[PDB]
Design a protein around this ligand. Structure first.
Ligand SMILES: Cc1cc2c(cc1C)N(CCC=O)c1c([nH]c(=O)[nH]c1=O)N2C[C@H](O)[C@H](O)[C@H](O)COP(=O)(O)OP(=O)(O)OC[C@H]1O[C@@H](n2cnc3c(N)ncnc32)[C@H](O)[C@@H]1O
Ligand SMILES: Cc1cc2c(cc1C)N(CCC=O)c1c([nH]c(=O)[nH]c1=O)N2C[C@H](O)[C@H](O)[C@H](O)COP(=O)(O)OP(=O)(O)OC[C@H]1O[C@@H](n2cnc3c(N)ncnc32)[C@H](O)[C@@H]1O
Lengths: 381, 383
């Protein structure tokens, strides 16, 4: 318990109208940056509007590694996702653990010393590693989970690759955050900056989680890799919240509020690149353009990166990566597994790609003008 | 208590152990070796035809959907229209869905133009669209407000002589929906109309006992109830809910081939009661289809039974079924009508259907699945 931790817990269900004013202020950019970002966004969208096997990079990590070489020389990197989540039995959790373990050895050998920014990494889900992750007591879940995650982190340290903890349901944020803190203070993992953590901008706690993580990085000496996403579980969080009879939800209910929150949280991360490695995971060209200009003219590999999903982000990020474009790197989140393990991920991709509010749907909607696509969320909210 | 024995048998099955549910289903689903050989031949033909050849919505409005239906109706298909909408969260939403169904019935009834409930189009409704807290509110309140709304829609359907089907949703809603079916079937204001329909899900342990109740209800009500037999659209959600609820035994089967056996056993029950029910075999699985086609025997007339399929999924299969030169059996297409603002939840149920490794529509495209396996009789696997 700390002042920074208390700020997180107090924001859990803070009323939506009270969360927004500080995010709007932090998300407000100068006219000069807004004009530049509108110009860049227009160019990206005009290029775009000239453009489940699609979502899986390979059935095995050996296959996925072989298929990554082409895009790696173009300037992309990878984070591999061994598909599987919500273990319901001990045997399932054990299988998922072994898949992560064998993936780290293969990825680490493939990395061949390229390090955590130039070379590939791995993403894991805590719900794959504990048989009753959502339905068991937090103190117990962390107690059996910690040895398994630390063991994987130690393997990632051995090869100097990134290891990212994906973000799942809102009611498991606090548990996963406690695990991150223990790992960052663990002396056995010293000198390795590959530990990564996802934060979801549709959550009311997002800016306070970031404050805690930025301070944790600074006092632990770990340059925590922070993947900023908007959030993949919105419809499930709304349904759970309505069932709980709550007046105030843990997530925003208007898409524009999530967009403002993302920009505000990006500004927070870009002000802290000394101690964290921001990873801006988005397929929205307006979001990308805003962050590109917010980051300033100074750039080096390891300052920050963008990220996208395999099979979704390549049309946009082909206009970003490389010296003929914006010369900024992008890490591709690469699912690996069978069609069976793919289903839950696929469903989330459908809720993303099929929603009228999604950038990837609007970009192909003849009713949606380019002027609307480059609107600054602060000016519209 | 009225129908005590039949009602007690439904309750007893609700969470009966899976191993105990199966032996009676396996026996009733066992067919002779000759029929199995003939069904294997038909299924092989259908799959060889299949493997040798927004997608889910028929139109944004009922007018557009009705216009788009003419081509397949000319071929021998019929339609059941689904105004996309379910799980109303506000009383205003329920009233909106009611008015959507009401106006659709007028439009479908005009288009039917007196063709009747078997040759002409009908409508499908979801009770969760018509009550704002359908899953959460006490049965007394849900029944007392829902029953006048569904009766009013049924009266309009009667006035145009079209079918009106109550879709099946989550397992904990079965009891209420069945009580409503009974009250409507005994309501004299609906006399002379056989268009009331009801879905039963074969992945549920209660399915054969629900069918017993429905067949007896048809006998005592004088209504020929339309019964759509489906396997079930909510499997992943039912498993998750039962886990959360702390149940030791689930209300649905957990082995996919058990659902297949349940379906064939229940088809056998329905096919022996066609005097008082109209069976509607909703499936995209060519092996299931072939099994029922041969189970039903050589005598057929339109109105005895029909097959059904979902728009954008089943037409390639049933193009090999409808029509004199094929199997000469009718198929009713379930036709969603709406926009993105109501389409996602149906898409998700369709993706969970289409994306699952155990689904026929996935296996037909799987290179590791032989035609031998696709035509295998699931009853032999469990016998
Ligand atoms: C690119 C990427 C995304 C995600 C992850 C990694 C990478 C590289 N990551 C791993 C995969 C898990 O699914 C991850 C994600 N989400 C999550 O909760 N935890 C994780 O560990 N990833 C998905 C990500 O959150 C997001 O859903 C997509 O990238 C789409 O976002 P994007 O910025 O591309 O698109 P926009 O269309 O501008 O926004 C879509 C998002 O907006 C939110 N939304 C939609 N309606 C809303 C209403 N009515 N109120 C509030 N918020 C709303 C949603 O978050 C929606 O996804
Ligand atoms: C054709 C059709 C289908 C459905 C409906 C109408 C019509 C005309 N109807 C309305 C649409 C609602 O979503 C309806 C359906 N389902 C339902 O519960 N209530 C309804 O009112 N419809 C869908 C239908 O149930 C079904 O899901 C599909 O047709 C697919 O089944 P089909 O016979 O085509 O294909 P198979 O692939 O042989 O079987 C798939 C089914 O098997 C079950 N399953 C999957 N995993 C299982 C495990 N592990 N154990 C047990 N059973 C399992 C599921 O039922 C799965 O759908």
């Amino acid at each position: 318990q700390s002042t920074l931790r208390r700020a997180i817990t107090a924001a859990y269900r803070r009323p939506e109208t009270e969360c927004l004013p500080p995010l709007v202020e932090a998300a407000t950019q100068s006219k000069e940056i807004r004009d530049a970002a509108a110009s860049t966004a227009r160019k990206l969208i005009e290029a775009l509007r000239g453009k489940g096997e699609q979502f899986v990079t390979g059935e095995t990590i050996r296959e996925a590694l072989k298929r990554s070489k082409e895009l790696e020389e173009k300037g992309f990197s990878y984070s591999y996702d061994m598909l599987g989540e919500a273990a319901t039995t001990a045997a399932d959790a054990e299988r998922y653990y072994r898949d992560y373990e064998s993936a780290i050895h293969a990825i680490g050998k493939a990395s061949a010393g390229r390090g955590i920014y130039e070379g590939p990494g791995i993403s894991i889900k805590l719900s794959a590693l504990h048989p009753r992750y959502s339905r068991a007591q937090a103190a117990r879940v962390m107690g059996e989970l910690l040895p398994r995650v630390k063991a994987l982190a130690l393997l990632a340290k051995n090869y100097d690759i990134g290891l990212n903890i994906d973000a799942e349901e809102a009611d498991r944020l606090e548990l996963s955050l406690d695990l991150l803190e223990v790992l960052c203070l663990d002396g056995d993992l010293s000198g390795w900056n590959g530990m990564g953590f996802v934060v979801q901008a549709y959550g009311k706690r997002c800016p306070f989680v970031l404050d805690f993580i930025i301070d944790l990085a600074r006092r632990s000496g770990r340059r925590i890799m922070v993947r900023l996403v908007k959030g993949a579980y919105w419809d499930a969080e709304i349904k759970r919240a309505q069932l709980d009879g709550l007046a105030d939800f843990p997530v925003f209910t208007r898409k524009i509020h999530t967009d403002v929150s993302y920009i505000a949280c990006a500004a927070k991360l870009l002000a802290a690149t000394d101690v964290v490695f921001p990873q801006f995971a988005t397929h929205n060209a307006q979001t990308l353009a805003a962050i590109y200009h917010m980051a300033g003219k100074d750039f080096h590999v390891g300052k920050y990166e963008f990220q996208c999903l395999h099979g979704m982000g390549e049309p946009l990020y082909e206009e970003v990566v490389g010296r003929g474009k914006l010369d900024r790197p992008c890490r591709i989140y690469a699912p690996v597994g069978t069609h069976e393990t793919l289903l839950a991920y696929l469903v989330r991709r459908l809720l993303e790609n099929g929603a009228n509010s999604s950038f990837v749907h609007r970009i192909n909607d003849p009713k949606v003008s380019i002027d609307e696509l480059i609107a600054d969320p602060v000016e519209v909210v």
